[PDB]
Amino acid sequence: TVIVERWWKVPLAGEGRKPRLHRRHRVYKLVEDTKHRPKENLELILTQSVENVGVRGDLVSVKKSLGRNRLLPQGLAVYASPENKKLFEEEKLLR
Amino acid sequence: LTYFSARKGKRKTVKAVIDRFLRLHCGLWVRRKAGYKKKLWKKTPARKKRLREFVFCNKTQSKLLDKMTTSFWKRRNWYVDDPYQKYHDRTNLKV
Amino acid sequence: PLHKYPVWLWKRLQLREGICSRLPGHYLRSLEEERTPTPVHYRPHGAKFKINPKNGQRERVEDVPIPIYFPPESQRGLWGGEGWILGQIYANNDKLSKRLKKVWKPQLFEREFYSEILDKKFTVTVTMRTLDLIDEAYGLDFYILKASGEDLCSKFGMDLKRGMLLRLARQDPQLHPEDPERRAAIYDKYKEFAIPEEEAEWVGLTLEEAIEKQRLLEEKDPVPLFKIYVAELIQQLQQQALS
Amino acid sequence: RLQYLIDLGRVDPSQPIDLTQLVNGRGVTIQPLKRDYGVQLVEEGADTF
Amino acid sequence: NFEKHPKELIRGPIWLRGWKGNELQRCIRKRKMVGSRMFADDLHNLNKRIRYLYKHFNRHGKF
């Protein structure tokens, strides 16, 4: 994904009006890319003990690739949704 | 100088003039002397002094400036404490 | 001469006029909505007023979206809100340097997605942005449901959504027997959403498709006039008997 | 100017002189577009008031 | 009692009803007021006229 700042300034047109645009408003200047960004980490609840990377029942911050192409498809983990979190807590308590 | 604009069909102002000059209500045009913020070392003090004064434009120049602007820049403006306010109106003329 | 209504309104008029009027009220509403989609390729001016530089003065600040271009590859599989950007660049980002045209493409992929409501694995063209969105909404199904039609950005996605809605409505067996409890559980996950069965049929359709559907619905065979005549005769006879 | 107005009947000094009253009288014409911020009282008829 | 202005008496094309104007100006007004619901073949012509007119006024003549 590319974020593209618009050079040349759209001249500001009303509440309920489209602002017509010019072939110089078509000129852009890319401010940032979503790529070339600090890689973030995703939260997952583990349904199974995995190696040293996760303890069963616990909520861990994983590398996103690992989450998306291994853990989630293989039923080894689930998203940090508030829904199932409660359930997991309950399970822990029971244990 | 756009005697008729595209959308409104009114005359436009050449904004260079507006940037550079001050129209007194009497229709004198006041200008900062050129070459006044430049190469001041080589210039003799008297010359510097001369260059730091404001100046009144020639009749022809004034006329040109009037043509170049719209009637808005020629209105009476009642500023609170503009330093030039006293020069707008003219006193004790005789031909 | 002059036209009665302007040319931008002709399409609207057309809807009123014929077969498009026979389409239901809840469907045409969707067509008419056309809201502002989620910003993807530009940072928005979140506040309506900013106070600019150069002069210490507040002024209004509207945010005009970058037009975007979706090539027909993107209709086949879920891309995000993002599609191809078509624009121009100044050469070394000085305006006094040359202006030259530019096409900015999204980074495409090909990935599988299991959908609980559908019980099937869909290979999808999926941008990173889409993946991120999915993660945010947790389930792919959830994302499909949650994502507003303008936001979703694909015909395929829309279709999927429609299917999901239908499933929710009917309460049809996706897991077949030996998993009724499981099915119930799944359903309970998505008690939110779940529109009436008649509305969910029309969801995520083009105009032409909708029209076709409508036609199919009210095609039939023409009824014999003879039958009608006979009925009338019978009625008359009955009336006579009564009197 | 104010004095003149008073003399002429328009602008009643038994009431308060608010901007509105002045406007009604038609002593001071003012215009919000072109950024007028109201009347300013001036010294011009200081004596003979 | 000033219920109606004399400019509301006049019957004519909507774009110039109580509005004097100029050649170019009139064209512009037409384009804005009516152009939306104007015949393709004529709208184009109008646009062309406007283009020409601007050039003629803003550039071509004397003084």
Added chain:
Amino acid sequence: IPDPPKHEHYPTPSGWQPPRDPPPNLPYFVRRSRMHNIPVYKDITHGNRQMTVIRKVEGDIWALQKDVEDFLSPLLGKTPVTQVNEVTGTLRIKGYFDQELKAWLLEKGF
């Protein structure tokens, strides 16, 4: 527009004075404006040319003109140079004599 209140002593401050009753019998009469001022005005035709105008004149304009001439001849050392227009009861007198003219009018009692 309201008719101005009856003050205690004329001429009022800001040098106003009403048109005195009864009307002074003369060949000419000068109505006042909307605002009850005596209608003599400055005018500058060109950049140079400066003049005064008495414009509400009624009846015998010629007589009025003559009177004006008589009045103003000792100041200038001339015959003032006047363009009367009979149709619209007016009087273009060359050079400003506005305030003086007004004063004269007041004295006369218009």
Added chain:
RNA sequence: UUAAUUUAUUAAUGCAAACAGUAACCUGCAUUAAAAAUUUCGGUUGGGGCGACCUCGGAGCAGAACCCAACCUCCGAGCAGUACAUGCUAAGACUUCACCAGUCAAAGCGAACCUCAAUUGAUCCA
């Protein structure tokens, strides 16, 4: 094209992004190439070319208030040196035949007790 500005196209690379593991194919940003693409080709001139010149000053033509040309005749300049009140301001003038640029300058307030012929360059931008 070895004139300028560009590389959006193709070129490989390089760095990201995607990837896998263990003790390639695509997108984004950089790179230099190839290929191209916009583009312009100043004036004076005893035709044009070639050669020379193109701004400023002094002398002659121009003998006595200014002004006065030529690819007319002759010298030169594109700096120095001394200061560091080469501080502030200000009546009134001159002016390179316009404008812009230049010049002179009484008084006053502050202080003491400029030389030099030419010696320079607008606006916007930095």
Added chain:
RNA sequence: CCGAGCCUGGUGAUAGCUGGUUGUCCAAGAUAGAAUCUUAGUUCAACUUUAAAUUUGCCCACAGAACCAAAUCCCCUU
């Protein structure tokens, strides 16, 4: 009619260049210089026209305008 086809559209393209600009009668009315990719043009000045306001305008007579011819400037009277 290929140094890059033809047609339509943008296109009433653009021309400091050339050509052309149609009833009567009267009046005033001529080329000091500037800069300028500028000398086939331009914009200031100068001259020219009109409408104003005005007081001086032209002709000019003695005096006067360094040193290293013809004349001119200034100039009261007239």
Added chain:
RNA sequence: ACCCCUAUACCUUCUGCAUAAUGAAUUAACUAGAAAUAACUUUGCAAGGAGAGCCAAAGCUAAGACCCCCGAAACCAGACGA
């Protein structure tokens, strides 16, 4: 009626054209100055004017009155042709 005397077509372009410089066989009909600021003018009202907004140290409202035609080689977009 000729014969006598006087008499260098026109337009354009020119420092200057009878020029042997351009154009024009002739008739007919068609064929080329259109825009406001700012001025001036005469009305209207007037320390105000104006049918909101705008202008106003005599103004403001009003009308009237100035600003051509023909002509490239060209450039680009989209069709059509071996």
Added chain:
RNA sequence: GCUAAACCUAGCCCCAAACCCACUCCACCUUACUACCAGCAACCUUAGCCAAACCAUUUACAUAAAGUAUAGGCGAUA
């Protein structure tokens, strides 16, 4: 006296109002106007003339606020 002249009314222009058109039969996407036999499919910024007296960034495509704020080789102009 020949050639010729002359001649109103076809219709048309600009508004206003109102949202139009489209199967007697047969034929017509194959070489259209053809009675009768086994495989594709649409979407992808406009540019340039031109103006800037060259030319490269750049140049418009109800009323009032307002040709105001802003933009701009800070200029043309928008």
